[PDB]
Design a protein around this ligand. Sequence first.
Ligand SMILES: [Mg+2]
Ligand SMILES: [Zn+2]
Length: 310
Amino acid sequence: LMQFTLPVRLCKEIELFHFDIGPFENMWPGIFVYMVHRSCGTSCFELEKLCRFIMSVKKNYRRVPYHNWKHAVTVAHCMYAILQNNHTLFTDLERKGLLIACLCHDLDHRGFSNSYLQKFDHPLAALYSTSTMEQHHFSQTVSILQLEGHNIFSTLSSSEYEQVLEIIRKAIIATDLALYFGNRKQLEEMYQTGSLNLNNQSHRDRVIGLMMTACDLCSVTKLWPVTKLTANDIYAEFWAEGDEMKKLGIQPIPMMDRDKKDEVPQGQLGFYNAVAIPCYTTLTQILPPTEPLLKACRDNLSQWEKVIRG
Ligand SMILES: [Mg+2]
Ligand SMILES: [Zn+2]
């Protein structure tokens, strides 16, 4: 009977795709519990276990400019908005699993890409050859779920537990952008030829993978003042990785070079055209109620076009 409530402005704007979770970090756990309760029910998780799972997840995110605790909650909010607008399409296990997968998808991120770990010869690159960081984020998630008093899935059967952990594993691995390109091409082909079948588990996995990419890139779907400020945090990480590449004796790509700061607007156009617009277009074809994400993405693309033209 202990329902979570938000102030009037948050209660209303939290339903919109472009919601910004605000600068008050101590409100983010309550915002996440509110989303879980409205998304799958007040009974799907024991509140005490859920709150201690959330605080351990928070503790395992680092103080990096972009891939931090705020990103985790923002990505879970985009998933909440997708699930709420496509209410009949997902199973009880999927709703439970996807919000948790989004909260944990970047656990213990250090601000470095998979390419940097490979060139540095980091131990994680020997342990996981492909999707290096993403396999580490899933491994961190399993570690937290195995802590005393943190198993939020304890009332699930052995079979259902294995299913929810498999949903989480695939959802987290799908956040590796290198896998997105082929996934979106396969989905576009299945949709156009009419062979896309949501009753086929293999097709469901692809659709969930595209939803993870869409949530993960949701900074490009906020209102322009938010999108523009978030780009500073994204580039603060890219530039630090570029500096680390220079220390290895490798010239970074222009996007990561802080001496090529002037090329940022043009690089943003390339990203929206090659990555963001295709992603939200294919997502709207499969899930028509996600159209506001594509609309906001197109608005930000034209704002970046205005930046290049002075
Ligand atoms: Mg990631
Ligand atoms: Zn992420």
